[PDB]
Amino acid sequence: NNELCLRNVFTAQNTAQDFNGNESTVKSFYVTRTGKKILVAITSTKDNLKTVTCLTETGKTVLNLDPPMRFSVVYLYFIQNISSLNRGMVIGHISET
Amino acid sequence: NNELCLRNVFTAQNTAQDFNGNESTVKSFYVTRTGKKILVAITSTKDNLKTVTCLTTGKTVLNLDPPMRFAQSVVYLYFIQNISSLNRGMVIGHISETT
Numbered sequence: 001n002n003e004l005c006l007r008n009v010f011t012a013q014n015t016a017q018d019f020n021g022n023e024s025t026v027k028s029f030y031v032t033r034t035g036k037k038i039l040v041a042i043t044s045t046k047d048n049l050k051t052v053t054c055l056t057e058t059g060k061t062v063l064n065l066d067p068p069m070r071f072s073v074v075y076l077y078f079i080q081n082i083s084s085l086n087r088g089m090v091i092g093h094i095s096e097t
Numbered sequence: 098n099n100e101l102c103l104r105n106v107f108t109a110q111n112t113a114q115d116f117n118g119n120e121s122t123v124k125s126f127y128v129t130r131t132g133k134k135i136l137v138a139i140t141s142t143k144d145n146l147k148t149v150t151c152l153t154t155g156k157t158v159l160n161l162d163p164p165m166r167f168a169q170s171v172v173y174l175y176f177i178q179n180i181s182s183l184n185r186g187m188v189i190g191h192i193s194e195t196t
Contacts (some may be wrong), residue, residue, distance in 0.1 A: 001165060002163065002164075002165050002166065003166050003167065003180065004163065004165040004167040004174055004189075004192075005167060006167065006189070006192070006193045006196060007189060008193055009193075029167075032174060036185060046166070054124065056118060067098070069099050069100065069101040070099075070100050070101065071100070071101040071103065073182070076101050083182065084181065084182035084183040084186065085182045085185055085186040085187060085189070087183055087185040087186060088104075088186020088187045088189075088190065089186040089187075089189060089190040090107075090118060090140035090186075090190075091101075091103065091104055091183075091187065092104065092186065092187040092191055093190055093194075095103040095104055095105050096190075096194065097104070
């Protein structure tokens, strides 16, 4: 017997930084699981983001981004080394909306 | 550069076999991408399913992972053996927004 843990995807916003250190607001995609959240991906019209801010209880954490993927034009970035399961959750969410 | 291929989930029905060899109809979850589909999971009220028959090469029997329980009625979710973690995420997300 093993109970399925249903997870949710929630979008919000965060600050991201490009290679020149300039900040901008991005749409952020979180996977949540009863109390716990993980920042999985962001979207932006900017193709030059390098990092993104995630706010925790500990304070701010700065996360590296994987290269922008294309989908006036909006880019999707996954957070580096995020699990494939969490990636799948977010891809489905973006597609099913 | 790397373009993002959106994936979808759609559901239909398949025939599954339990450890007795007895057959029943189940709800099937497919992930689609680039005009191709892959069977990722099934759900059933039965907790004893062992295999599911898929139509690909032709007719093929696939093994199921052990059931996971979720809720009025109790349902069991079975992933197809060796399906990717990415595809599991797709189906878990879909079932979450259904619930």
